[PDB]
Scaffold this active site. Structure first.
Site, PDB file in Angstrom:
ATOM      1  N   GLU A  97      55.417 -96.125 -16.053  1.00  0.00           N
ATOM      2  CA  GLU A  97      54.180 -96.880 -16.239  1.00  0.00           C
ATOM      3  C   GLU A  97      54.498 -98.211 -15.576  1.00  0.00           C
ATOM      4  OE1 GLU A  97      51.242 -98.262 -17.185  1.00  0.00           O
ATOM      5  OE2 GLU A  97      50.454 -96.214 -16.890  1.00  0.00           O
ATOM      6  N   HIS A 125      46.755 -87.518 -18.414  1.00  0.00           N
ATOM      7  CA  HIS A 125      46.015 -87.708 -17.178  1.00  0.00           C
ATOM      8  C   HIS A 125      45.771 -86.381 -16.520  1.00  0.00           C
ATOM      9  CE1 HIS A 125      46.731 -91.865 -17.881  1.00  0.00           C
ATOM     10  NE2 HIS A 125      47.953 -91.488 -18.221  1.00  0.00           N
ATOM     11  N   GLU A 143      51.299 -76.608  -7.339  1.00  0.00           N
ATOM     12  CA  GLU A 143      52.648 -76.117  -7.157  1.00  0.00           C
ATOM     13  C   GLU A 143      52.824 -75.467  -5.771  1.00  0.00           C
ATOM     14  OE1 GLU A 143      56.401 -75.533  -9.512  1.00  0.00           O
ATOM     15  OE2 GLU A 143      54.792 -76.986  -9.360  1.00  0.00           O
ATOM     16  N   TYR A 186      48.137 -81.766   1.437  1.00  0.00           N
ATOM     17  CA  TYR A 186      47.135 -82.036   2.465  1.00  0.00           C
ATOM     18  C   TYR A 186      47.114 -80.940   3.516  1.00  0.00           C
ATOM     19  CZ  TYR A 186      47.629 -86.748   0.381  1.00  0.00           C
ATOM     20  OH  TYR A 186      47.831 -87.858  -0.358  1.00  0.00           O
ATOM     21  N   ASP A 201      47.211-101.689  -8.108  1.00  0.00           N
ATOM     22  CA  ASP A 201      46.242-100.646  -8.392  1.00  0.00           C
ATOM     23  C   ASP A 201      46.615 -99.914  -9.680  1.00  0.00           C
ATOM     24  OD1 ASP A 201      43.813-100.177  -7.176  1.00  0.00           O
ATOM     25  OD2 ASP A 201      44.467 -98.297  -6.234  1.00  0.00           O
ATOM     26  N   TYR A 214      39.949 -94.173 -14.172  1.00  0.00           N
ATOM     27  CA  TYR A 214      40.519 -95.514 -14.220  1.00  0.00           C
ATOM     28  C   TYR A 214      40.987 -96.079 -12.884  1.00  0.00           C
ATOM     29  CZ  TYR A 214      44.807 -92.547 -14.687  1.00  0.00           C
ATOM     30  OH  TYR A 214      45.839 -91.644 -14.568  1.00  0.00           O
ATOM     31  N   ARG A 215      40.764 -95.315 -11.814  1.00  0.00           N
ATOM     32  CA  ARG A 215      41.161 -95.669 -10.445  1.00  0.00           C
ATOM     33  C   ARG A 215      40.388 -94.718  -9.554  1.00  0.00           C
ATOM     34  NH1 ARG A 215      47.391 -95.198  -8.027  1.00  0.00           N
ATOM     35  NH2 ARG A 215      46.999 -96.336  -6.081  1.00  0.00           N
ATOM     36  N   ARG A 237      35.458-104.883  -4.542  1.00  0.00           N
ATOM     37  CA  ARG A 237      36.640-104.309  -5.195  1.00  0.00           C
ATOM     38  C   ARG A 237      36.338-104.142  -6.660  1.00  0.00           C
ATOM     39  NH1 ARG A 237      41.295-101.566  -6.535  1.00  0.00           N
ATOM     40  NH2 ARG A 237      43.183-102.844  -6.742  1.00  0.00           N
ATOM     41  N   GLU A 249      55.485 -83.607  -1.436  1.00  0.00           N
ATOM     42  CA  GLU A 249      54.169 -83.405  -2.036  1.00  0.00           C
ATOM     43  C   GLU A 249      52.995 -83.664  -1.091  1.00  0.00           C
ATOM     44  OE1 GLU A 249      53.378 -84.017  -6.571  1.00  0.00           O
ATOM     45  OE2 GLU A 249      52.452 -85.646  -5.408  1.00  0.00           O
ATOM     46  N   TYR A 273      62.233 -81.520  -5.096  1.00  0.00           N
ATOM     47  CA  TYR A 273      61.505 -82.770  -4.901  1.00  0.00           C
ATOM     48  C   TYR A 273      61.164 -83.488  -6.191  1.00  0.00           C
ATOM     49  CZ  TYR A 273      56.332 -82.188  -5.747  1.00  0.00           C
ATOM     50  OH  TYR A 273      55.077 -82.062  -6.271  1.00  0.00           O
TER      51      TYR A 273
HETATM   52  C1  LIG Z   1      48.942 -88.406  -0.913  1.00  0.00           C
HETATM   53  C2  LIG Z   1      49.428 -88.641  -2.244  1.00  0.00           C
HETATM   54  C3  LIG Z   1      49.121 -89.839  -2.793  1.00  0.00           C
HETATM   55  C4  LIG Z   1      49.519 -90.153  -4.107  1.00  0.00           C
HETATM   56  C5  LIG Z   1      50.242 -89.166  -4.875  1.00  0.00           C
HETATM   57  C6  LIG Z   1      50.540 -87.911  -4.265  1.00  0.00           C
HETATM   58  C7  LIG Z   1      50.163 -87.642  -2.993  1.00  0.00           C
HETATM   59  C8  LIG Z   1      50.489 -86.331  -2.380  1.00  0.00           C
HETATM   60  N1  LIG Z   1      50.702 -89.312  -6.169  1.00  0.00           N
HETATM   61  C9  LIG Z   1      50.408 -90.556  -6.691  1.00  0.00           C
HETATM   62  C10 LIG Z   1      50.868 -90.778  -8.002  1.00  0.00           C
HETATM   63  O1  LIG Z   1      51.439 -89.982  -8.720  1.00  0.00           O
HETATM   64  N2  LIG Z   1      50.765 -92.096  -8.458  1.00  0.00           N
HETATM   65  C11 LIG Z   1      50.042 -93.129  -7.917  1.00  0.00           C
HETATM   66  O2  LIG Z   1      49.905 -94.196  -8.493  1.00  0.00           O
HETATM   67  N3  LIG Z   1      49.515 -92.848  -6.711  1.00  0.00           N
HETATM   68  C12 LIG Z   1      49.730 -91.638  -6.098  1.00  0.00           C
HETATM   69  N4  LIG Z   1      49.248 -91.437  -4.744  1.00  0.00           N
HETATM   70  C13 LIG Z   1      48.500 -92.545  -4.040  1.00  0.00           C
HETATM   71  C14 LIG Z   1      49.473 -93.580  -3.428  1.00  0.00           C
HETATM   72  O3  LIG Z   1      49.248 -93.637  -2.032  1.00  0.00           O
HETATM   73  C15 LIG Z   1      49.292 -94.941  -4.109  1.00  0.00           C
HETATM   74  O4  LIG Z   1      49.569 -94.943  -5.459  1.00  0.00           O
HETATM   75  C16 LIG Z   1      50.153 -96.109  -3.705  1.00  0.00           C
HETATM   76  O5  LIG Z   1      51.506 -95.936  -3.284  1.00  0.00           O
HETATM   77  C17 LIG Z   1      49.203 -96.891  -2.850  1.00  0.00           C
HETATM   78  O6  LIG Z   1      49.850 -97.364  -1.748  1.00  0.00           O
HETATM   79  P1  LIG Z   1      50.445 -98.789  -1.615  1.00  0.00           P
HETATM   80  O7  LIG Z   1      51.649 -98.775  -2.435  1.00  0.00           O
HETATM   81  O8  LIG Z   1      50.553 -98.969  -0.146  1.00  0.00           O
HETATM   82  O9  LIG Z   1      49.483 -99.894  -2.117  1.00  0.00           O
HETATM   83  P2  LIG Z   1      48.461-100.667  -1.158  1.00  0.00           P
HETATM   84  O10 LIG Z   1      49.216-101.607  -0.352  1.00  0.00           O
HETATM   85  O11 LIG Z   1      47.616 -99.682  -0.463  1.00  0.00           O
HETATM   86  O12 LIG Z   1      47.669-101.566  -2.203  1.00  0.00           O
HETATM   87  C18 LIG Z   1      46.821-100.814  -3.116  1.00  0.00           C
HETATM   88  C19 LIG Z   1      45.633-101.615  -3.459  1.00  0.00           C
HETATM   89  O13 LIG Z   1      46.089-102.801  -4.159  1.00  0.00           O
HETATM   90  C20 LIG Z   1      45.246-103.920  -3.721  1.00  0.00           C
HETATM   91  N5  LIG Z   1      46.026-104.986  -3.003  1.00  0.00           N
HETATM   92  C21 LIG Z   1      47.263-104.691  -2.418  1.00  0.00           C
HETATM   93  N6  LIG Z   1      48.083-105.632  -2.336  1.00  0.00           N
HETATM   94  C22 LIG Z   1      47.423-106.689  -2.901  1.00  0.00           C
HETATM   95  C23 LIG Z   1      47.772-108.075  -3.052  1.00  0.00           C
HETATM   96  N7  LIG Z   1      48.947-108.514  -2.606  1.00  0.00           N
HETATM   97  N8  LIG Z   1      46.865-108.925  -3.646  1.00  0.00           N
HETATM   98  C24 LIG Z   1      45.690-108.403  -4.067  1.00  0.00           C
HETATM   99  N9  LIG Z   1      45.253-107.115  -3.974  1.00  0.00           N
HETATM  100  C25 LIG Z   1      46.184-106.302  -3.355  1.00  0.00           C
HETATM  101  C26 LIG Z   1      44.223-103.370  -2.716  1.00  0.00           C
HETATM  102  O14 LIG Z   1      42.933-103.160  -3.257  1.00  0.00           O
HETATM  103  C27 LIG Z   1      44.950-102.162  -2.247  1.00  0.00           C
HETATM  104  O15 LIG Z   1      44.079-101.270  -1.665  1.00  0.00           O
END
Ligand SMILES: *Cc1cc2c(cc1C)nc1c(=O)[nH]c(=O)nc-1n2C[C@@H](O)[C@@H](O)[C@@H](O)COP(=O)(O)OP(=O)(O)OC[C@H]1O[C@@H](n2cnc3c(N)ncnc32)[C@H](O)[C@@H]1O
Ligand SMILES: *Cc1cc2c(cc1C)nc1c(=O)[nH]c(=O)nc-1n2C[C@@H](O)[C@@H](O)[C@@H](O)COP(=O)(O)OP(=O)(O)OC[C@H]1O[C@@H](n2cnc3c(N)ncnc32)[C@H](O)[C@@H]1O
Ligand code: HEC
Ligand code: HEC
Ligand SMILES: [Cl-]
Ligand SMILES: [Cl-]
EC number: 1.17.9.1
Lengths: 73, 515, 515, 73
Positions: B171, B430, B280, B378, B161, B467-468, B506, B374, B361
């Protein structure tokens, strides 16, 4: 066993939000909450709290964590 | 009950029969009680809209190949998840009602962590928590990069993602090197150097030869990622986190413009997070209900009082310094003199805000140690309603004032707060806004959906696009990028997935669309 | 005369008629005397094998759209070039005999160079020389990155082939942000943020939303790049180049392993080039004929004598330090102590080797000032024969000894020299070998072709593959990466180019292949 | 004019290899080489020396550089 012990599932997953020092979720330590309740909250999720599927936290590890929580002060 | 779009009960039953024969009985989930945890969403819509028909759990690549083979036979739409902790983006629930979930949580093997070349090759189910234990147990001099979900989330899913972290390797997609995907036709494709027999360079050289396709798979539905490699930062001998608290809201314009050259020259190597008062606050675990119970947004009066009581500013910046003591001391002098010349903000060190939150944290997130603090965000309003709205702009101070006022105005219109942070990268900034609401209250839920649409409309008008985004608004955001892009994306989709089985919808890519 | 594969004289004549009507008469080249300069190659094959049928010069995007429209009508294979200075890789000549050359040298407008956000948006024909003049004239605090061809070569063409430079922004494709391509169907596609109306983020945020396709176009034939954006390094206040000369050939094993952590921690931010004696010699403008006239390779005896006469070592490393005086002085102490603890090699500063070559050209290449000094490598044996053989390995010292012995053994077998340099990046090591020969001598030419094939066979056996190669060996190298990759690549090709007009054969992608 | 003057084409392209201080190519300064020769070497290329198409260096700029080269000592 998927997480080995109940203390392990707590330290690795649940405690990150639930341990008294953190405070994202309420204290579960020594409150005597039924296993059947802890299972429904984990499988359904509850408002701010997310849900964990069986693949992440299986039924057996849920019983273990329920038992570890009751035994603490 | 719940069935895939275009699939009949009998055709679905033949498919579920084949899934059982291939995987076993305990790996195929079709009952409501075992399917319910995948349905939990923080989106302003009823669960029924993103309810899965089934859920299969694969452990090997051969099984994934078997699953897609069966899916092609009976035209079964499959939604792939790894760790499935995508909170505020759709969670683990499908983009469309009735798709089968390919849950790869059990495919959790850490294949290799090279402590010399500094890389890791993992499987989908590996969590950052699992990786941190392995690193602490085996005493490896590597550091990990992740976001708040950290411990419970994983490298593969976050990178698919194109997610972000808080260390210099923040990054995540930029640090990705080599991936294995199984295509819709059952073929196992390896990017970069992985196709070369006997090679040891898959996690060493990114591109390979010919078109480099790692990017084609991220945020797309052209393959199921079964293995992924990425680079790990070598653990520095000295880590120096710091915070700079700012009293006035208008200060954001001068901060960003002063920080950009330090961030572009790599003096401050990690992404600088500048957090608003409410962000914060939620992260320090303060709720709205302990300050006011009045309807609508939180007034400027109470935000000013929150600042007085806690000592938190209008904008709170966090950043870090890495390297040897000598290079840290030198970069410290450069960072210090910039804040002194500006005559604004007070420096808070690791000495002053010791074991205090929110410093603790953020310092942990910046050094790769997991914590879920963080998640307090919620608890600000509670109810489990949260959507991420995050547009991108130039790392220019005038852009902060412009976007903030635009966001704040649309949020207040619907009774929601401006809970946001700016993450300043070398050139991009961002604007991460958490539109938090109460999902149990049907009226606030209907307003949150409306607020989200208006934030997209308002920002698109001024040339900004996200972008997401969450699964519900994925088709909408696809429109912000134009028709040619969509035409090209559906052309590649017809080529690699003729039967439209790989997660249709998707990112707005579905063969049932007219492109 | 020379005609495209599968196109008849009459069908070619209708096409050339339409090309003239669209572009003019002076923009369509069909005569041998005006087509001859595109034919100049340094490959071990006769010119006839890579001879173009025609050459068209477009200046606008609308013209490129017109050219592909005509090419689709009469199935005319088109080979696109920008600055066309691809020496040792095919030059400006087609991959297959008879293709028309789309020469975009005249499409040379520098669209924007932002001195604050530090980026550039250019057209194909822009050269690095053109960019350097504009930067020196307008006093912009930006630095440029390029390789030896510098002045006469360009950003677009070098990046389409994923070329490399010598500054911290040396990995050119990694610093690329935003591109515009015209597809085979005439559509103009913009990557990342370019599709969003009214955006100013195209050269700011790389990915955009949905699949990110910049990589799909590089080293491929799925589009014609008409605009490209990239990041520029801000000019640092202090630049400190240095050289470390090493006497013994076996020293390479300890150098690389000692340099890797300094390169991985970004203490030495630019790619460290470790040059062999013969590379160092050819770049200092010494010929083989002024040392020995004996047939075959240059014996160890004369290499030892060359070292004595000039003071050049077995391995000569060049690197640089950037930043403020204070951070340079600190990084200098760290680099110095590593070489002292090793007890090998002598440090040569800008003070000692003042206006001396090869130090002067390398120092210029590392600070973005153009010079063509390294072209002396073609004067080592002369004759205009040169092919680049460049495999990739881990930045491990044991890999240097392994690959060197393998290369040296195959080169000597055919009477050719081991003229090479290792370019050490954080994790990847590049073994750039210039197989230099005399192209005017038909016997040496036939041996060079044979030597090249054997270098590919020998290295492929030990798990090594090249990531860039001349037009003649492009189909061969495609085989090193496996069948699934090739199947996926031809699938995408059928989708975006059904008529096979866009440079068939580039990187082994041609619809006349059975994939 | 594409390069403006003959001195310009020399400073920007040719001189990078041909100026006496560099030495990749032989000195062309004040050797009196015919324009017709300078045109055939540039259009055909000569062994180590590459070829430049008309789009890069046109016929007119070739005449200018030829004339600038003769006039020097
Ligand atoms: C609640 C919260 C969420 C946050 C955050 C802060 C808080 C308090 N801060 C974030 C941040 O700074 N940076 C981020 O990039 N995200 C933040 N998030 C959201 C966070 O939950 C997610 O970034 C991330 O950890 C998503 O969870 P995940 O790691 O479990 O990924 P996923 O399994 O849900 O997969 C995401 C997405 O990717 C596609 N998909 C997954 N795996 C595959 C494979 N193997 N092949 C093809 N597609 C795949 C799919 O669409 C999935 O939903
Ligand atoms: C002689 C020499 C060459 C060197 C070198 C040292 C010497 C002494 N050192 C190099 C190095 O360190 N790094 C490199 O990356 N290359 C080195 N080279 C070779 C050098 O000539 C080339 O890298 C490079 O500058 C090629 O020249 P170019 O910049 O003119 O690029 P090009 O126009 O030839 O285009 C290259 C390639 O890209 C494809 N193509 C070009 N343009 C397009 C567009 N617009 N759209 C689609 N495809 C395009 C095409 O296949 C072309 O051949
Ligand atoms: C943070 C992301 C959490 C993790 C990980 C776990 N829980 Fe949780 N839990 C969390 C919150 C924010 C809340 C409060 C929700 C609300 O809106 O009220 C909870 C609540 C519970 C409860 C109910 C407690 C009560 O009624 O007093 C239970 C039984 C519970 N949580 C259990 C639980 C278990 C067993 C976990 C590990 C598998 C776990 N939680 C993780 C936040 C988070
Ligand atoms: C480096 C890449 C060069 C550039 C740019 C130009 N020339 Fe060149 N030239 C170069 C070499 C290495 C050689 C010698 C080739 C050999 O194998 O001997 C040459 C030679 C010439 C000559 C021949 C002179 C003679 O003594 O007979 C001419 C007339 C010439 N070059 C002209 C020329 C012009 C006009 C250029 C700019 C358009 C130019 N050269 C550029 C290398 C390089
Ligand atoms: Cl969600
Ligand atoms: Cl060539």
């Amino acid at each position: 066993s998927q997480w080995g012990s109940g203390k392990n599932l707590y330290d690795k997953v649940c405690g990150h939000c639930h341990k008294p020092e953190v405070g994202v979720g309420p204290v579960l330590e020594g409150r005597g909450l039924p296993e059947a309740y802890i299972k429904d909250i984990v499988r359904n999720g509850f408002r701010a709290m997310p849900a964990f599927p069986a693949s992440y936290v299986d039924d057996e590890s849920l019983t273990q964590v329920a038992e570890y929580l009751s035994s603490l002060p | 009950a719940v069935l895939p779009k275009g699939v009949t009960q009998g055709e679905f039953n033949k498919a579920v029969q084949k899934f059982r024969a291939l995987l076993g009985d305990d790996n195929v989930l079709v009952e409501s009680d075992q399917l319910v945890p995948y349905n939990k969403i923080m989106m302003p819509v009823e669960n029924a809209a993103h309810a899965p028909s089934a859920a299969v759990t694969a452990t090997t690549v051969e099984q994934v190949q078997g699953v897609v083979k069966i899916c092609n036979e009976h035209k079964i739409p499959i939604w792939t998840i790894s760790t499935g902790r995508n909170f505020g983006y759709g969670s683990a629930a499908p983009v469309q009602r009735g798709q089968v979930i390919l849950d790869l949580k059990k495919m959790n093997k850490i294949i290799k962590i090279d402590p010399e070349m500094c890389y890791a090759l993992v499987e989908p189910g590996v969590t950052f928590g699992q990786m941190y234990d392995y690193i602490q147990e085996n005493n490896l001099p590597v550091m990990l990069s992740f976001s708040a979900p950290s411990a419970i989330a994983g490298p593969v899913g976050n990178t698919m993602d194109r997610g972000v972290g808080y260390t210099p390797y923040g990054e995540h997609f930029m640090m990705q090197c080599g991936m294995e995907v199984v295509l819709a036709n059952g073929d196992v494709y390896r990017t970069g150097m992985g196709g070369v027999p006997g090679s040891n360079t898959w996690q060493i050289f990114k591109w390979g030869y010919g078109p480099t396709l790692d990017g084609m798979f991220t945020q797309a539905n052209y393959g199921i990622c079964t293995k992924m490699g990425f680079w790990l930062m070598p653990k520095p001998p000295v880590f120096k986190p710091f915070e700079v608290i700012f009293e006035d809201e208008a200060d954001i314009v001068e901060i960003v413009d002063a920080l950009r050259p330090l961030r572009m020259s790599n003096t401050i190597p990690n992404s600088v997070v500048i957090a608003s008062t409410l962000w914060e606050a939620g992260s320090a675990h303060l709720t709205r209900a302990q300050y006011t119970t009045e309807p609508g947004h939180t007034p400027d009066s109470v935000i000013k009082q929150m600042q007085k009581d806690t000592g938190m500013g209008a904008w709170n910046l966090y950043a870090a310094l890495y390297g040897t003591q000598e290079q840290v001391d030198v970069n410290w002098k450069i960072v210090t003199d910039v804040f002194k010349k500006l005559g604004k903000g007070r420096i808070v060190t690791q000495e002053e805000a010791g074991d205090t939150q929110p410093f603790k944290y953020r310092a942990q997130l910046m050094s790769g140690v997991p914590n879920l603090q963080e998640f307090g965000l919620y608890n600000w309003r509670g109810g489990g309603g949260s959507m991420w709205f995050a547009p991108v702009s130039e790392a220019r101070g005038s852009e902060c004032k412009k976007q903030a006022a635009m966001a704040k105005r649309v949020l207040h219109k619907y009774g929601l707060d401006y809970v946001a942070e700016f993450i300043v990268a070398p050139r991009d900034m961002h604007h991460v806004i958490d539109v938090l609401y109460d999902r149990t209250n049907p009226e606030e839920t209907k307003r949150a959906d409306a607020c989200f649409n208006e934030l997209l409309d308002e920002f698109e008008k001024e040339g900004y696009a996200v972008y997401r985004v969450n699964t519900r608004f994925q088709d909408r955001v696809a429109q912000s990028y134009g028709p040619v892009k969509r035409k090209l994306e559906h052309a590649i989709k017809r080529a690699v997935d003729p039967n439209n089985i790989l997660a249709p919808g998707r990112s707005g890519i579905d063969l049932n669309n007219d492109f």
